[PDB]
Amino acid sequence: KEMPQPKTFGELKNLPLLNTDKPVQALMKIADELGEIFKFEAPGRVTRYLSSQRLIKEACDESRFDKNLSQALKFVRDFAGDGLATSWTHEKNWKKAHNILLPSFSQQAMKGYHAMMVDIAVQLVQKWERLNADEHIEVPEDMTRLTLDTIGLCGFNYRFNSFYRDQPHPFITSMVRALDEAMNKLQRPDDPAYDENKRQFQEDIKVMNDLVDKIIADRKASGEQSDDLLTHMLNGKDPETGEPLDDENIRYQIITFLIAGHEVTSGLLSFALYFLVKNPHVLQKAAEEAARVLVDPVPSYKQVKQLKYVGMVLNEALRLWPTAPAFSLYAKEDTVLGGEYPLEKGDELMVLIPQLHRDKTIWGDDVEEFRPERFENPSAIPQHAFKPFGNGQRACIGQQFALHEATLVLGMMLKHFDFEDHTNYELDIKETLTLKPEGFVVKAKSKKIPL
Amino acid sequence: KEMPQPKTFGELKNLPLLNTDKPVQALMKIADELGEIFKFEAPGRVTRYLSSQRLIKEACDESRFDKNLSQALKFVRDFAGDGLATSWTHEKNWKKAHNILLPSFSQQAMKGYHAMMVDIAVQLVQKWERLNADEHIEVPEDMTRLTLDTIGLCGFNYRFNSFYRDQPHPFITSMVRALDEAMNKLQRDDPAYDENKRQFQEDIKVMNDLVDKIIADRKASGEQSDDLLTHMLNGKDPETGEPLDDENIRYQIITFLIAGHEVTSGLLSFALYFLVKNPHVLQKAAEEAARVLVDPVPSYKQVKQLKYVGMVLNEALRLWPTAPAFSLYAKEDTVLGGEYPLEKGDELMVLIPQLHRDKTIWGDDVEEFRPERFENPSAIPQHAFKPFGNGQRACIGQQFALHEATLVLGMMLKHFDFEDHTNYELDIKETLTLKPEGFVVKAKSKKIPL
Numbered sequence: 001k002e003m004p005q006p007k008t009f010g011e012l013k014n015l016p017l018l019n020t021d022k023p024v025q026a027l028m029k030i031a032d033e034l035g036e037i038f039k040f041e042a043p044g045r046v047t048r049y050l051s052s053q054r055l056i057k058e059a060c061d062e063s064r065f066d067k068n069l070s071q072a073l074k075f076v077r078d079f080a081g082d083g084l085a086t087s088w089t090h091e092k093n094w095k096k097a098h099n100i101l102l103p104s105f106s107q108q109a110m111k112g113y114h115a116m117m118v119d120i121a122v123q124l125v126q127k128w129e130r131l132n133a134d135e136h137i138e139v140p141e142d143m144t145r146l147t148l149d150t151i152g153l154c155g156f157n158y159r160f161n162s163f164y165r166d167q168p169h170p171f172i173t174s175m176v177r178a179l180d181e182a183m184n185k186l187q188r189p190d191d192p193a194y195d196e197n198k199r200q201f202q203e204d205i206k207v208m209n210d211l212v213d214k215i216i217a218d219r220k221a222s223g224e225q226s227d228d229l230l231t232h233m234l235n236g237k238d239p240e241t242g243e244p245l246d247d248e249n250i251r252y253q254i255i256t257f258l259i260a261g262h263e264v265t266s267g268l269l270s271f272a273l274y275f276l277v278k279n280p281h282v283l284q285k286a287a288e289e290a291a292r293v294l295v296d297p298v299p300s301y302k303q304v305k306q307l308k309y310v311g312m313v314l315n316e317a318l319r320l321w322p323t324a325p326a327f328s329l330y331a332k333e334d335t336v337l338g339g340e341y342p343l344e345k346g347d348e349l350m351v352l353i354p355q356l357h358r359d360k361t362i363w364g365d366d367v368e369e370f371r372p373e374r375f376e377n378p379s380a381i382p383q384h385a386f387k388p389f390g391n392g393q394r395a396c397i398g399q400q401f402a403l404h405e406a407t408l409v410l411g412m413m414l415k416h417f418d419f420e421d422h423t424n425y426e427l428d429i430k431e432t433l434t435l436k437p438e439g440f441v442v443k444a445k446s447k448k449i450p451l
Numbered sequence: 452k453e454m455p456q457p458k459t460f461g462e463l464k465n466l467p468l469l470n471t472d473k474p475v476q477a478l479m480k481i482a483d484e485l486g487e488i489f490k491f492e493a494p495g496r497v498t499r500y501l502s503s504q505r506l507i508k509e510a511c512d513e514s515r516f517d518k519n520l521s522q523a524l525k526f527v528r529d530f531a532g533d534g535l536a537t538s539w540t541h542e543k544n545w546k547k548a549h550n551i552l553l554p555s556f557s558q559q560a561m562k563g564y565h566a567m568m569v570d571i572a573v574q575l576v577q578k579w580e581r582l583n584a585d586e587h588i589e590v591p592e593d594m595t596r597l598t599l600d601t602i603g604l605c606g607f608n609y610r611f612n613s614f615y616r617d618q619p620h621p622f623i624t625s626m627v628r629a630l631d632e633a634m635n636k637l638q639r640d641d642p643a644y645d646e647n648k649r650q651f652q653e654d655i656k657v658m659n660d661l662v663d664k665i666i667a668d669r670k671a672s673g674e675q676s677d678d679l680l681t682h683m684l685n686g687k688d689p690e691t692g693e694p695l696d697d698e699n700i701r702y703q704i705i706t707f708l709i710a711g712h713e714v715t716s717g718l719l720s721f722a723l724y725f726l727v728k729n730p731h732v733l734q735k736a737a738e739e740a741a742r743v744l745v746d747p748v749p750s751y752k753q754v755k756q757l758k759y760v761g762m763v764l765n766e767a768l769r770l771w772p773t774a775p776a777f778s779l780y781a782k783e784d785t786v787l788g789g790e791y792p793l794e795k796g797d798e799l800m801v802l803i804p805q806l807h808r809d810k811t812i813w814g815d816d817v818e819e820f821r822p823e824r825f826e827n828p829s830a831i832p833q834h835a836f837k838p839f840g841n842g843q844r845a846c847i848g849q850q851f852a853l854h855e856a857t858l859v860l861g862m863m864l865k866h867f868d869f870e871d872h873t874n875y876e877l878d879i880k881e882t883l884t885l886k887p888e889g890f891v892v893k894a895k896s897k898k899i900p901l
């Protein structure tokens with residue numbers, strides 16, 4: 001009945017607990033001490049962090065709870081606008097864009113993106129083939145180069161050409177810095193010293209809008225059709241309203257795809273490769289499948305679907321380190337959570353996904369072990385025990401994109417190289433809007449298989 | 452490219468090879484001679500028996516192969532109906548019952564069945580505690596009493612009371628006799644089988660009448676239990692929104708008893724056989740049982756901690772998987788192993804005991820009983836170990852079977868020392884399943900109270 005709460009800081013309540021560079025990991029440690037639910041207070045803010053499948057399955061009841069914009073999402077909305085991820089469910093543009101974009105993200109739609117995904121994946125493999133002996137790979141850096149370029153190409157047929165660069169494309173520099181500012185504001189008491197941050201934030205917003213608005217304008221003037229999301233958004237109409245997306249919302253969707261999609265996906269690939277080199281038996285089983293299935297120089301769409309064990313590796317990586325580590329909900333009406341926590345209408349909840357995925361009552365005692373065999377039969381996973389892509393109608397629209405992209409790339413990586421954990425890398429998880437293993441490096445010895 | 456085939460008998464092709472009391476062991480011997488794949492033909496039938504992990508890992512690709520009803524399953528369907536085990540994947544009632552029943556067979560659902568499993572397990576232990584000196588245990592007989600009573604209690608809150616009986620409950624007599632007729636039909640319709648046909652229909656009626664009565668009795672009473680019948684009367688398929696009808700519920704209950712009891716009792720009997728044949732392994736398992744089972748009654752959490760007992764059971768399943776085969780058909784034209792082209796509809800049989808003896812997977816000591824092989828599931832190649840079938844058509848009862856077997860074997864190892872007093876020679880009887888016929892032991896109580 002009485003809800004636990006972590007240590008407080010006088011008038012600041014729990015807010016200084018987030019004044020740390022690893023807030024998700026701090027919140028996981030708090031959940032370890034306090035259990036399946038704890039209250040978190042800040043000035044003008046009250047929320048409750050959920051960690052058990054028992055309570056989270058109730059929070060995922062869409063008749064009782066709807067998606068809430070966390071403070072992180074509210075600050076990201078300053079440049080993601082009313083794109084899909086930072087829209088409220090009741091805003092006209094959410095359901096409108098949802099209806100228009102859902103067919104463009106289906107499993108069937110991945111067939112049309114596959115060639116562009118292979119384009120960037122080949123660039124990654126060729127980069128690694130061209131490294132000299134005893135040179136090493138900066139894993140999250142290269143994975144981010146790949147995910148950003150892949151979403152740029154599939155999103156609006158634009159090449160950031162990240163594998164030709166040390167310094168990222170100016171758009172990416174502003175995007176990353178806009179994301180940093182949004183997350184930094186959370187742990188912030190906005191005195192005059194943050195005036196430089198505010199000025200830079202508006203400059204980065206303009207850089208992103210200008211490039212995306214220019215590409216939309218360029219595409220409309222040309223009239224060209226590609227296999228990208230931009231073409232689908234220029235031509236698609238919402239069956240409900242009968243309306244197409246306007247040019248401003250299309251810009252916010254493109255910005256959203258880059259922001260919401262690139263970092264979670266590169267983090268997944270980096271964590272998956274980390275767990276593979278830390279678990280050689282798993283790596284051998286995954287590499288066997290990649291060699292058996294990927295019999296052609298370029299993987300086909302159908303071949304990627306056959307990489308079953310690679311998909312199990314990826315899901316187990318998402319279980320331990322879900323790269324989008326939380327989502328937020330609010331009570332649609334007064335309701336009682338778990339039969340003992342009464343909530344009033346509007347009360348907020350946070351789903352702490354890494355803790356959910358460590359619920360021993362669901363996964364057993366070996367929760368911290370990396371065992372892709374947990375996912376050998378998907379039906380053995382209880383409802384709402386595994387939520388790396390969120391919940392319900394507000395779940396990740398990019399889920400099939402992310403998993404096709406990650407399965408393809410990890411498959412090709414395992415087909416073409418043996419990997420050495422040459423530094424015995426100590427896992428260090430950097431936190432931004434997402435999670436990723438900072439400083440993860442490996443050596444790749446080519447199997448000398450041509451492309 | 453050219454597929455081997457065992458000796459033929461003119462117009463009967465390979466069919467007389469199955470006119471034997473141990474057809475699985477005969478098929479294993481054929482695989483020893485012919486290798487990883489051989490064609491098997493009978494009048495109006497062609498199939499291919501697979502024995503290597505190399506080919507079986509491809510056969511387990513659900514995008515290329517779906518479950519086929521073998522001739523055995525087709526004959527079992529005459530009384531199991533469109534229950535889960537004898538339905539095609541494309542039948543509406545398969546996916547419907549699958550969606551409804553899957554939560555009631557989960558690892559989490561075992562917590563609710565645990566008390567009823569303990570009920571029957573205690574009856575088994577008490578029977579053995581009450582034996583006189585120099586009396587012995589008939590192991591497969593007692594294990595079958597246990598598993599049948601456990602599924603009756605957890606399935607529909609019915610007590611067959613097998614430990615109070617010499618002659619089985621009438622339902623069991625008809626069920627066993629219907630299974631025997633189904634398997635006998637394989638190796639076989641002249642006028643002489645008219646008695647078999649008449650008896651077969653009588654046993655079907657006995658099974659339907661009792662199960663239909665229990666369903667009707669439950670609906671009339673309205674009482675709720677922690678059994679599968681209650682879940683089926685109240686559950687609705689999330690996809691269609693429909694509940695199972697009373698006829699299908701009857702087929703599911705019949706299926707649980709037919710598909711679950713004999714495989715599970717065979718596993719326990721084989722596991723105890725291997726334990727008494729391997730005293731060092733027995734001691735390690737008994738050491739774990741004493742360390743873990745510190746209470747008079749095992750808890751659910753304690754059974755989950757019987758790690759080595761679980762490895763013992765898995766190794767018993769490796770050597771003698773009590774459901775010895777499953778059947779598949781090619782969804783489209785496809786090439787198996789890069790050298791065996793198959794047409795759409797072509798049939799495959801997975802010979803599980805041979806798969807589990809693939810030296811390229813397990814090493815040269817394939818015939819040795821070493822539970823330590825299963826210490827790390829990630830070290831086992833894909834599809835090397837298939838005692839519970841494959842994919843969405845895998846055994847829905849896997850968690851039920853392993854929980855019951857771990858609980859019961861744990862209690863057996865806690866409470867008794869076992870003597871292989873006859874130096875028993877393994878003799879595997881074949882029905883629909885496999886079990887060690889005539890396996891007997893003596894149990895000396897450790898005098899630990901319940």
Ligand code: HEM
Nearest residue numbers: 084085257261264265268324327389390394396397398402
């Ligand atoms: C491993 C990769 C990914 C993970 C773990 C992930 C995770 C998530 C999560 C947890 C949510 C729900 C957020 C909330 O409820 O507040 C979400 C929503 C969303 N994601 Fe992803 N995501 C991934 C990849 C992608 C990709 C590749 C794209 C697009 C190219 C994408 C686009 C979106 C969008 C648009 C939404 C909002 C959908 C809506 O509310 O209508 N994501 N994602």
Ligand code: HEM
Nearest residue numbers: 535536707711714715718774777839840844846847848852
């Ligand atoms: C050691 C014990 C057991 C073993 C080795 C075993 C083995 C198997 C195998 C190999 C299959 C797949 C058959 C095929 O593909 O044709 C299967 C399916 C099935 N088993 Fe078991 N089983 C065991 C225990 C149980 C129990 C205790 C139950 C129920 C109480 C059960 C119910 C079922 C059902 C319903 C199916 C069909 C599932 C479906 O197709 O949807 N089994 N079993």
Ligand SMILES: O=C(CCCNc1ccncc1)N[C@@H](Cc1ccccc1)C(=O)O
Nearest residue numbers: 018023024070072186260324325326327433
């Ligand atoms: O809730 C969040 C934001 C989670 C990121 N969500 C997302 C990513 C990608 N795509 C869609 C959605 N974070 C937690 C943890 C946190 C982070 C930073 C500071 C404090 C706390 C939160 O509690 O807000």
Ligand SMILES: O=C(CCCNc1ccncc1)N[C@@H](Cc1ccccc1)C(=O)O
Nearest residue numbers: 469474475521523637710774775776777883
């Ligand atoms: O394929 C079979 C039947 C396998 C039993 N399947 C099963 C058991 C329990 N639960 C679900 C499913 N048998 C083999 C071997 C055989 C037996 C009898 C006669 C001939 C051959 C087969 O090839 O048919």
Ligand SMILES: *N[C@@H](Cc1ccccc1)C(=O)O
Nearest residue numbers: 040042045070071072073186
């Ligand atoms: N991810 C949470 C973190 C937070 C909680 C409470 C106050 C401020 C920030 C969010 O973005 O809301």
Ligand SMILES: *N[C@@H](Cc1ccccc1)C(=O)O
Nearest residue numbers: 491493496521522523524637
């Ligand atoms: N288990 C097999 C046995 C069989 C093979 C070939 C012809 C008839 C029977 C089956 O049940 O189909």
